[PDB]
Amino acid sequence: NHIDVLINGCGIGGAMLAYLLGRQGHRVVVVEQARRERAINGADLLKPAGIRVVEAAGLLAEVTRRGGRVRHELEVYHDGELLRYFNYSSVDARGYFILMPCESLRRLVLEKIDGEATVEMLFETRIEAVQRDERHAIDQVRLNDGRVLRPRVVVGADGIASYVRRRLLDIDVERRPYPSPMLVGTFALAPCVAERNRLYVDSQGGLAYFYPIGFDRARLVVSFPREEARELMADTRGESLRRRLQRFVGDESAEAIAAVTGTSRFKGIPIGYLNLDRYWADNVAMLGDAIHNVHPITGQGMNLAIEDASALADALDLALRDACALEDALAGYQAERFPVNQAIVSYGHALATSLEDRQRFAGVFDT
Ligand SMILES: Cc1cc2nc3c(=O)[nH]c(=O)nc-3n(C[C@H](O)[C@H](O)[C@H](O)COP(=O)(O)OP(=O)(O)OC[C@H]3O[C@@H](n4cnc5c(N)ncnc54)[C@H](O)[C@@H]3O)c2cc1C
Numbered sequence: 001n002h003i004d005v006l007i008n009g010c011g012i013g014g015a016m017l018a019y020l021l022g023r024q025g026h027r028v029v030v031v032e033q034a035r036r037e038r039a040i041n042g043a044d045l046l047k048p049a050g051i052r053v054v055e056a057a058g059l060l061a062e063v064t065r066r067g068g069r070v071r072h073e074l075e076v077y078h079d080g081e082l083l084r085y086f087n088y089s090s091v092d093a094r095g096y097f098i099l100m101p102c103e104s105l106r107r108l109v110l111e112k113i114d115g116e117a118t119v120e121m122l123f124e125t126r127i128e129a130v131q132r133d134e135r136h137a138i139d140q141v142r143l144n145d146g147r148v149l150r151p152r153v154v155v156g157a158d159g160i161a162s163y164v165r166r167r168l169l170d171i172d173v174e175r176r177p178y179p180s181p182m183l184v185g186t187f188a189l190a191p192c193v194a195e196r197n198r199l200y201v202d203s204q205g206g207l208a209y210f211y212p213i214g215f216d217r218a219r220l221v222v223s224f225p226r227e228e229a230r231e232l233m234a235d236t237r238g239e240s241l242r243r244r245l246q247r248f249v250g251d252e253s254a255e256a257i258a259a260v261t262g263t264s265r266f267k268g269i270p271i272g273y274l275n276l277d278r279y280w281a282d283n284v285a286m287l288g289d290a291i292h293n294v295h296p297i298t299g300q301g302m303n304l305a306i307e308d309a310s311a312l313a314d315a316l317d318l319a320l321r322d323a324c325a326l327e328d329a330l331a332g333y334q335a336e337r338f339p340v341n342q343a344i345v346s347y348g349h350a351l352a353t354s355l356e357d358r359q360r361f362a363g364v365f366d367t
């Protein structure tokens with residue numbers, strides 16, 4: 001019943017890790033509490049560092065074949081006037097980003113895992129209990145199907161409310177909510193949205209970000225102070241939201257506003273602030289939202305899960321092929337990822353708290 005790696009969670013992070021380890025013939029069991037087909041919804045953005053992972057995994061061609069869109073521009077408006085235009089390819093030819101729904105990319109990765117004979121995905125399954133040895137390493141894990149496994153490594157890829165973090169590592173994280181929630185809705189695609197990503201903010205705390213997703217749809221991500229957000233979502237025919245948008249979204253995006261036909265299909269987006277001091281202990285390591293939570297205004301939640309998965313796959317491959325001890329590989333993982341994750345967590349908070357103040361917001365961008 002010896003395996004190399006037990007991964008708790010089959011989100012984008014855990015799926016990517018499973019796939020990269022499986023490609024090397026490592027014996028992997030992935031435990032996921034949900035059904036495989038549970039349509040989750042998540043982040044839509046891949047940044048250059050995430051794209052590098054997807055490309056190295058051999059998946060980049062397939063991403064655009066399945067509705068992923070290459071982009072290299074963003075317009076940012078404040079109080080209806082253009083504050084910044086960013087052209088990410090204006091120095092770096094490979095500066096581009098990709099818009100790809102998390103669930104589409106995850107389905108692609110699962111299709112690859114289906115072809116890897118050393119990886120076993122267990123859906124509608126959870127860990128029940130673990131047993132530690134005299135060195136304090138997890139050596140036996142019992143699942144709620146009664147299966148017992150003996151993994152060399154246990155990974156928490158189990159997201160924002162990580163079971164591994166809370167129940168195996170005994171970490172409690174301080175909750176510090178933001179006063180403005182964020183919501184995302186999917187609408188018909190207007191030509192203006194097809195043309196260029198446009199982010200709008202105003203001095204009263206409003207945010208509206210319009211961008212295309214898949215072949216023939218568009219997202220609108222909004223943020224308002226909580227009580228206002230409540231009132232705008234309550235008028236379900238969308239008239240209050242559309243008129244609030246018209247206060248800070250100019251006519252370039254008028255057709256995108258008109259596409260907002262109601263509010264009933266908006267979904268909340270979680271908003272945390274976290275970067276754990278330790279990404280690992282003993283033979284247990286964590287990735288993605290289990291270890292950090294970035295403000296979703298950064299767009300980077302999926303991207304950082306993928307970057308972490310790739311780093312952790314590198315570290316675990318070294319340890320499992322006996323190129324170094326596990327504790328040294330896990331320390332190297334943390335050395336590599338902690339600074340990157342820390343910068344984006346700090347930057348997300350700096351963006352979210354500067355929105356209303358035009359000069360400060362611009363200053364956060366310039367870095
Ligand atoms: C609707 C929505 C919109 C979002 N939009 C944005 C955005 O605009 N910008 C942004 O930066 N981020 C956004 N996010 C956050 C982003 O998707 C996450 O950062 C990303 O999914 C993290 O990936 P992960 O693999 O670490 O965790 P997840 O994708 O959360 O995957 C974790 C997996 O673990 C499983 N799991 C949990 N507990 C257990 C258990 N006990 N046993 C077994 N399995 C378990 C879950 O079922 C899940 O499949 C959004 C999230 C949502 C839901």
Ligand SMILES: Nc1ccccc1C(=O)CC(=O)O
Nearest residue numbers: 043044045209221297298299
């Ligand atoms: N990148 C962003 C910038 C401002 C507001 C929201 C987002 C996102 O929410 C993108 C995503 O869905 O990953």
